[PDB]
């Protein structure tokens, strides 16, 4: 702010002001609020809580069976070298 003498800035907005209204009042709000609809315990989703496999491992079962059977052919006898 600058004040300049001799033209000085009025020393106030004075008493000639026009009170325009008495509408100043905010009427307090008084209220009762009830949000009470029956609630049912459940919601349907496509899927909740699953941690789906991105790849599975290979998996398997097992079997064996049979017996011990055989047809054989042997090497001929040979002269013994030494000993």
């Amino acid at each position: 702010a600058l004040i300049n003498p001799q033209f000085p800035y009025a020393g106030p907005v004075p008493i000639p002001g026009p009170a325009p209204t008495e509408t100043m009042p905010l009427l307090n709000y008084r209220v009762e609020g009830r949000i009470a609809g029956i609630q049912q315990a459940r919601q349907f989703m496509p899927f909740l809580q699953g941690p789906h496999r991105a790849v599975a491992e290979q998996t398997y079962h097992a079997i064996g069976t049979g017996i011990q059977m055989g047809q054989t052919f042997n090497q001929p006898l040979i002269n013994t070298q030494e000993g």
Partner: protein
């Protein structure tokens, strides 16, 4: 006799012969012989095979 011969204009994918005389073609007979290839003298150890 239903798969081996294709008429002109018909799909020849599964057929053996195709042509104008197809409708009157037929097998006189078919023979097959199956030969099995395997490895013998199945080893046995202290565990068995």
């Amino acid at each position: 006799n239903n798969t081996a011969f294709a008429a002109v204009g018909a799909n020849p994918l599964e057929a053996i012969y195709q042509g104008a005389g197809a409708a009157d073609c037929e097998f006189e007979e078919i023979s097959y012989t199956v030969y099995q290839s395997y490895l013998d003298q199945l080893p046995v150890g202290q565990n068995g095979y």
